[PDB]
């Protein structure tokens with residue numbers, strides 16, 4: 001039973017969702033169109049990045065719709081309509097997009113081709129498992145650290161740190177081995193991943209006021225900003241990495 005909202009709280013969220021649907025659609029066309037601005041060996045990362053924002057565009061379209069159908073303007077206030085606001089769309093969006101986000105980065109990393117598929121496979125499945133393990137905790141009724149939410153948050157953190165560990169301490173021989181420009185861009189993408197991905201378990205723990213206007217607005221706005229940055233913003237960095245590499249490899 002979502003709380004009644006002021007026009008300002010309702011509109012801030014609604015426009016934020018609408019902006020994200022527009023931004024993901026633009027990113028999809030940009031990444032699709034960008035396919036041909038990079039060498040052939042990197043067009044796969046661009047198709048993966050286009051898939052990521054297409055899937056997020058679609059889910060945010062569902063999210064925007066659900067938000068609107070869940071409220072009605074009555075006397076200068078947005079009152080719950082009885083229709084449920086579905087939070088699952090974002091969770092399903094994470095399950096499908098997080099593995100691809102890791103594969104994208106692996107493909108522009110500059111690893112020898114005998115190391116590329118194994119790393120994409122390991123990181124992609126660790127990311128999927130991280131989301132799977134978070135599931136029981138997110139649908140949990142009790143937000144206790146010493147309870148269901150803390151248990152699954154802990155289990156899910158395992159594959160998460162495992163991924164972070166690999167990106168920050170198991171690849172050095174590769175990033176450092178790149179030109180300054182590329183090494184820099186790659187370092188920035190890894191850092192953007194840490195910062196944006198880091199937001200999610202932090203928001204997960206905050207509960208550890210359930211449904212007051214201020215808490216739903218803050219959470220929806222925070223998750224939406226993080227999703228935009230972790231997928232569209234991050235995709236732009238992946239694109240500039242593929243581009244710079246393509247130019248170095250004297251490609252036209």
Ligand SMILES: CC1=C(/C=C/C(C)=C/C=C/C(C)=C/C=C/C=C(C)/C=C/C=C(C)/C=C/C=C(C)/C=C/[C@H](O)C(C)(C)O[C@@H]2O[C@@H](COC(=O)CCCCCCCCCCCC(C)C)[C@@H](O)[C@H](O)[C@H]2O)C(C)(C)CCC1=O
Pocket residue numbers: 145149150151152153154157160184185188189191192194195196197198199201202204205
């Ligand atoms: C869930 C749960 C649990 C688990 C909890 C867990 C796992 C919690 C985990 C928390 C985590 C992982 C938190 C992580 C936090 C990470 C943070 C705060 C990272 C901050 C990073 C910062 C401030 C980075 C600054 C980087 C800078 C100034 C870089 C400068 C570059 O060298 C420059 C030269 C400027 O790069 C240029 O800009 C580039 C542009 O890209 C960039 O500038 C890259 C952007 C990267 C910056 C990211 C900052 C985002 C803000 C942080 C938000 C905080 C949120 C986490 C709340 C290129 O355009 C140019 O080509 C390049 O030359 C338990 C407790 C275990 C159990 C219970 C339970 O349930």
Ligand SMILES: *C/C=C(C)/C=C/C=C(C)/C=C/C1=C(C)CCCC1(C)C
Pocket residue numbers: 093094097098101130131133134135137152153154156157160196197198200201204226227230231
């Ligand atoms: C576009 C969506 C992205 C980048 C989503 C990333 C989500 C995570 C890194 C989620 C992590 C979680 C944990 C590390 C533990 C607690 C439960 C989760 C699923 C919120």
